Amino acid sequence: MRVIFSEDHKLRNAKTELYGGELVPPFEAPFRAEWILAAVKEAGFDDVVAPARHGLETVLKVHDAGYLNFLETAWDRWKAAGYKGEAIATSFPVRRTSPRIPTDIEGQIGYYCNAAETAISPGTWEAALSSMASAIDGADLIAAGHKAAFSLCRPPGHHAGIDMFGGYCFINNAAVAAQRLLDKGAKKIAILDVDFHHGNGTQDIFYERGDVFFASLHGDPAEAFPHFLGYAEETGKGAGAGTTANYPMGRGTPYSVWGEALTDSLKRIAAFGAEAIVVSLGVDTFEQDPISFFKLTSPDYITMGRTIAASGVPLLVVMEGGYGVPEIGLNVANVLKGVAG
Amino acid sequence: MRVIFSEDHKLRNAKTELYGGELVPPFEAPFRAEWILAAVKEAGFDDVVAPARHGLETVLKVHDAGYLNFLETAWDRWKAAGYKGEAIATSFPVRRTSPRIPTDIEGQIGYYCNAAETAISPGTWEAALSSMASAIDGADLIAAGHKAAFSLCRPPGHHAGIDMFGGYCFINNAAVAAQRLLDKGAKKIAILDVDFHHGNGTQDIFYERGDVFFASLHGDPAEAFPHFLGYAEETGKGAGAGTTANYPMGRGTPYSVWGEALTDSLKRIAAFGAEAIVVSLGVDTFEQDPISFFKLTSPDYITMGRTIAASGVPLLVVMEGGYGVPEIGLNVANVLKGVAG
Numbered sequence: 001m002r003v004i005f006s007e008d009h010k011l012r013n014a015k016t017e018l019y020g021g022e023l024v025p026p027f028e029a030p031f032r033a034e035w036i037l038a039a040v041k042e043a044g045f046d047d048v049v050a051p052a053r054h055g056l057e058t059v060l061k062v063h064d065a066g067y068l069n070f071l072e073t074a075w076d077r078w079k080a081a082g083y084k085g086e087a088i089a090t091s092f093p094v095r096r097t098s099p100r101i102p103t104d105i106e107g108q109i110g111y112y113c114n115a116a117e118t119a120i121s122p123g124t125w126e127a128a129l130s131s132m133a134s135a136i137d138g139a140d141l142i143a144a145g146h147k148a149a150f151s152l153c154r155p156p157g158h159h160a161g162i163d164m165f166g167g168y169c170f171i172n173n174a175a176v177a178a179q180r181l182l183d184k185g186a187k188k189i190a191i192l193d194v195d196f197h198h199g200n201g202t203q204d205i206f207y208e209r210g211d212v213f214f215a216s217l218h219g220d221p222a223e224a225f226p227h228f229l230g231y232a233e234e235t236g237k238g239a240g241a242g243t244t245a246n247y248p249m250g251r252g253t254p255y256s257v258w259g260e261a262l263t264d265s266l267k268r269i270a271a272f273g274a275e276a277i278v279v280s281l282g283v284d285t286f287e288q289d290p291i292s293f294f295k296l297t298s299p300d301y302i303t304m305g306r307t308i309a310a311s312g313v314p315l316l317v318v319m320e321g322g323y324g325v326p327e328i329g330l331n332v333a334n335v336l337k338g339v340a341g
Numbered sequence: 342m343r344v345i346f347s348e349d350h351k352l353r354n355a356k357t358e359l360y361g362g363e364l365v366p367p368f369e370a371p372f373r374a375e376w377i378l379a380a381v382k383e384a385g386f387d388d389v390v391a392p393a394r395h396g397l398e399t400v401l402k403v404h405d406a407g408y409l410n411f412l413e414t415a416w417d418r419w420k421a422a423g424y425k426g427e428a429i430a431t432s433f434p435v436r437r438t439s440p441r442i443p444t445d446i447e448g449q450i451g452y453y454c455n456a457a458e459t460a461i462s463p464g465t466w467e468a469a470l471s472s473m474a475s476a477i478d479g480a481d482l483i484a485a486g487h488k489a490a491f492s493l494c495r496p497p498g499h500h501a502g503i504d505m506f507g508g509y510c511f512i513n514n515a516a517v518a519a520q521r522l523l524d525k526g527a528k529k530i531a532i533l534d535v536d537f538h539h540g541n542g543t544q545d546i547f548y549e550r551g552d553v554f555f556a557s558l559h560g561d562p563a564e565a566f567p568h569f570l571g572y573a574e575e576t577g578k579g580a581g582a583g584t585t586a587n588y589p590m591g592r593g594t595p596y597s598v599w600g601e602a603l604t605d606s607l608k609r610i611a612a613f614g615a616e617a618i619v620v621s622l623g624v625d626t627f628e629q630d631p632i633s634f635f636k637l638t639s640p641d642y643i644t645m646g647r648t649i650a651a652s653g654v655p656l657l658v659v660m661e662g663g664y665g666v667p668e669i670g671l672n673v674a675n676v677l678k679g680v681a682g
């Protein structure tokens with residue numbers, strides 16, 4: 001299977017992340033992509049290509065235009081306003097607020113943000129566009145008839161909602177890939193989000209849509225980021241009724257339990273009739289992940305990839321989270337071994 | 342007039358504030374109260390007394406109980422979770438989120454916060470209770486027949502909403518004072534918020550209530566914190582119809598313009614029939630205020646106090662913001678000179 005990867009991910013190299021009341025170097029840092037790329041190559045997936053560049057046609061169908069316009073100029077405006085740090089929102093449109101959009105950079109960064117633990121830095125927009133391009137080229141391979149491809153996206157995407165960035169994400173790469181598949185002629189697509197965290201951004205984008213089924217397995221939002229979406233009761237609204245499926249799980253969840261949710265999610269996706277599945281793959285479900293509470297082992301990733309591919313429909317694997325340890329690469333490569341085996 | 346002031350304000354002495362993407366020493370620091378107290382005494386207001394302690398009976402009528410319970414243990418839980426910095430929210434319940442309340446400290450601090458530029462630190466709850474006590478004792482003096490009193494509140498209150506902290510505020514002291522006056526027998530009370538920033542917390546508390554008229558003069562939310570409330574169109578809802586009056590004003594506003602909004606606000610309060618006015622006094626309207634964009638001069642504060650007191654109804658002056666320079670004291674003292682003259 002082809003691996004689509006842009007060196008322009010490195011343009012996202014933020015200095016700071018607000019974590020535990022301190023500004024620390026980000027968990028979502030360039031070395032992640034280096035370690036994942038090296039491991040997938042070591043496992044024999046060495047057909048690595050850069051994405052073609054893409055404009056905004058596809059992404060404008062999943063993200064709000066004002067939001068994208070905001071991301072394009074956010075850094076420039078923040079710097080011009082005289083602030084000394086990276087661009088980090090402080091004020092947020094929470095309960096019982098006005099729906100109006102502010103005009104200044106301070107107000108707009110809050111309006112367009114769901115989490116203050118993500119700073120906008122120079123190069124962030126350009127990196128996010130490169131990561132989107134990797135997802136689009138992957139989707140194009142699936143549309144062209146390939147049964148598997150891997151888009152090594154960085155920055156990740158699944159916390160970016162219709163008009164909000166956060167959770168280290170700016171453009172929802174998996175949403176863009178699903179949209180691309182629809183634009184290329186699919187009528188029904190699924191996104192299966194196996195990252196430890198709920199894909200709240202992805203859920204938001206498709207919550208009222210019946211063309212994309214969204215399934216997520218994740219740490220219970222009562223106890224895990226993103227905190228404010230991902231409950232089992234959220235099954236969709238309007239045209240989206242019945243096509244969101246959340247599987248929240250608790251501390252210490254091992255594969256024997258997690259895999260039962262996987263089985264169920266795949267049953268739901270099959271009943272929906274997905275023509276392809278975009279897999280939002282984070283390996284932060286690993287027992288050693290520094291910010292997560294699941295207990296998957298490295299061999300479980302092979303089982304996971306095999307089970308998802310046994311759906312018998314084409315897969316685009318899109319990189320999301322997974323932090324800290326060298327095994328992030330092994331774990332991603334193991335998913336691909338399960339898909340390809 | 343009596344000045345009510347607790348030395349327990351100094352229990353709030355946070356080390357950090359998120360400002361311009363950096364963690365900096367807070368603007369809302371203990372030395373503010375020292376500057377203000379010294380200046381009011383110098384101006385002849387030396388009848389300074391500590392508040393009696395108070396329990397939660399009054400405050401439970403304006404703040405949510407879960408919110409108060411959260412503030413009571415937030416620091417302890419944050420520290421127990423192993424975080425190294427002060428307690429700062431990152432994730433927020435923004436557009437299209439679940440209304441559910443998380444269980445862990447990370448989720449709950451976001452649930453109960455409207456702004457990440459306010460850290461919870463050891464002593465914050467205790468300090469907030471002392472500040473509320475100063476407001477309650479001030480209200481009791483007005484209820485007993487005094488025509489003026491000054492509650493030297495710190496921390497300030499007006500950004501604390503029904504169930505949210507932020508903007509350096511935790512308990513809405515002015516709201517508690519207005520509630521106290523109703524509990525002591527008033528039927529109609531007004532809160533007049535002359536701090537540079539919109540009193541979004543106060544507005545939230547009384548937005549659907551018709552017993553308290555809320556008027557605020559402030560920097561336009563399109564361009565000023567708190568950004569997401571304070572537009573002129575917000576006039577109240579349900580029982581609160583017609584009893585919120587916002588006067589947003591732009592960059593550089595001087596007293597010649599600001600005073601016209603003051604006149605109009607007092608006409609509205611008089612037509613409502615307030616039996617007393619709780620003045621949320623911030624002197625961050627000053628031309629040298631480091632975080633604000635109005636251009637009031639020190640003599641303007643005398644005019645302001647005299648104009649508000651010409652309503653002919655009793656005033657409780659409750660301290661809010663005003664930063665950076667020792668002249669915050671002169672400016673507060675000048676409002677009191679205008680009231681007492």
Ligand SMILES: NCCCCC(=O)NO
Pocket residue numbers: 117159167168195196197225282284320321322
């Ligand atoms: N601050 C929490 C960010 C979580 C990032 C992540 O891995 N999302 O999948």
Ligand SMILES: NCCCCC(=O)NO
Pocket residue numbers: 090458500508509536537538566623625632661662663
């Ligand atoms: N981060 C802006 C906080 C300003 C708070 C304030 O002074 N309110 O009156």
Ligand SMILES: [K+]
Pocket residue numbers: 193194195196197198199216217218
């Ligand atoms: K997930």
Ligand SMILES: [K+]
Pocket residue numbers: 206207208209210211212213214236240243244
């Ligand atoms: K859907």
Ligand SMILES: [K+]
Pocket residue numbers: 534535536537538539540557558559
């Ligand atoms: K105000």
Ligand SMILES: [K+]
Pocket residue numbers: 547548549550551552553554555577581584585
């Ligand atoms: K009201």
Ligand SMILES: [Zn+2]
Pocket residue numbers: 145146147148
């Ligand atoms: Zn092929």
Ligand SMILES: [Zn+2]
Pocket residue numbers: 195196197282284320321322
């Ligand atoms: Zn994750």
Ligand SMILES: [Zn+2]
Pocket residue numbers: 486487488489
């Ligand atoms: Zn008296």
Ligand SMILES: [Zn+2]
Pocket residue numbers: 536537538623625661662663
């Ligand atoms: Zn203020």
